[PDB]
Design a binder for this molecule. Structure first.
Ligand SMILES: *[C@@H]1O[C@H](CO)[C@@H](O[C@@H]2O[C@H](CO)[C@@H](O[C@@H]3O[C@H](CO)[C@@H](O)[C@H](O)[C@@H]3O)[C@H](O)[C@H]2NC(C)=O)[C@H](O)[C@H]1NC(C)=O
Ligand SMILES: *[C@@H]1O[C@H](CO)[C@@H](O[C@@H]2O[C@H](CO)[C@@H](O)[C@H](O)[C@H]2NC(C)=O)[C@H](O)[C@H]1NC(C)=O
Ligand SMILES: *[C@@H]1O[C@H](CO)[C@@H](O[C@@H]2O[C@H](CO)[C@@H](O)[C@H](O)[C@H]2NC(C)=O)[C@H](O)[C@H]1NC(C)=O
Ligand SMILES: *[C@@H]1O[C@H](CO)[C@@H](O)[C@H](O)[C@H]1NC(C)=O
Ligand SMILES: *[C@@H]1O[C@H](CO)[C@@H](O)[C@H](O)[C@H]1NC(C)=O
Lengths: 50, 93, 106
């Protein structure tokens, strides 16, 4: 059976807050199609040639 | 049963109805206990009143308004949530 | 939308029958426990931060930005006054330093 992910629990409280003290720079890619191949068909020859 | 035969079948979905509920519950818990920080990295806890005050500050209203009308806002939210059940339970789906 | 995290900038690249993006993002790390309060009462008045949060180093109190740990002394230029000290739930007694009267008293 597939696993959804790792279990976690946030330490919520009446008066508690967390502030980061350091940062990381991340670079990610992303691929998107734009165009495909252009084609043309000769119907008269394809239906019956010669 | 369910028409069947003649080579017409129905394939069950990959994700059952329990995994989706687990995902939605996790999302709700994260939104409640972290705000919007869990969508960009590690989840950071913060009191709910402060998160709502910052959300008010994000739309051009100073944060003291919530700290003065917290009870009224909570009552309005509770009543609005309560009305949704009656709205959905009606036959006019 | 433009990458995962806080977007900074992007650079395009060409691919056959397509296009490739490179997203630069800002990701926080290394959080720490802290104690927070919604408001601070000094002289029967409620003080709220301008663009920060209230943090406590166990004993003292500071104000810092929400995305980076940078403590500062709570002054009258960091907070604004509105109301009294009997309507906000969770208010904490403290002192606010005035950066004008004590030194520039001449
Ligand atoms: C914030 O995080 C950065 C990393 O993203 C920290 O920089 C890294 O600091 C460690 C030590 O704390 C460096 O490791 C050691 O560096 C010395 C000096 O070059 C080297 O001789 C050792 O062999 C070891 O590698 C690490 O190199 C350094 N990373 C970079 C890219 O410079 C930074 O210290 C953190 N700042 C705070 C305030 O936590
Ligand atoms: C939390 O931060 C305060 C602010 O510096 C620390 O205060 C100490 O006491 C006085 C305040 O200026 C200084 O003479 C000490 O040098 C401070 N200690 C430092 C800077 O390490 C306080 O010690 C910090 N920790 C706790 C648990 O309160
Ligand atoms: C914060 O300061 C206020 C005002 O100084 C305190 O309110 C006083 O509380 C005492 C009891 O400890 C009463 O006898 C006084 O009548 C209150 N008012 C004044 C003007 O002194 C308050 O107790 C302090 N602490 C907190 C947590 O609010
Ligand atoms: C937070 O404070 C409220 C009001 O004092 C209290 O009812 C609640 O139990 C507290 N939550 C805790 C201590 O986890
Ligand atoms: C903050 O402290 C509590 C109890 O002292 C602890 O359970 C929690 O893990 C701490 N936070 C972090 C980020 O470690």
């Amino acid at each position: 059976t597939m696993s959804l992910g790792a279990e976690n629990s946030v330490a919520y409280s009446n008066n508690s807050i967390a502030i980061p003290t350091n940062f990381t720079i991340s670079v990610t890619t992303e691929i998107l199609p734009v165009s495909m191949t252009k084609t043309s068909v000769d119907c008269t020859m394809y239906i019956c040639g010669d | 049963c369910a028409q069947k035969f003649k080579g017409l079948t129905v394939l069950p979905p990959l994700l059952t109805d329990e995994m989706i509920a687990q995902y939605t519950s996790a999302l709700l818990a994260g939104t409640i206990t972290s705000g919007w920080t869990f969508g960009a990295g590690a989840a950071l806890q913060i009191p709910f009143a402060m998160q709502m005050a910052y959300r008010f500050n994000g739309i051009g209203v100073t944060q003291n308004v919530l700290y003065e009308n917290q009870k009224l806002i909570a009552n309005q939210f509770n009543s609005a949530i309560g009305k949704i059940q009656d709205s959905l339970s009606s036959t006019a789906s | 939308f433009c990458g995962k995290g806080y977007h900074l900038m992007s650079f395009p690249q060409s691919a056959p029958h397509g296009v490739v993006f490179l997203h630069v993002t800002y990701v926080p790390a290394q959080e720490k426990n802290f104690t927070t309060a919604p408001a601070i009462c000094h002289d029967g008045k409620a003080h709220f931060p301008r663009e920060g949060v209230f943090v406590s180093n166990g004993t003292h109190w500071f104000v810092t930005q929400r995305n980076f740990y940078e403590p500062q002394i709570i002054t009258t230029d960091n907070t604004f006054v509105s109301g009294n000290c009997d309507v906000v739930i969770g208010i904490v007694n403290n002192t606010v330093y005035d950066p004008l009267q004590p030194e520039l008293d001449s």
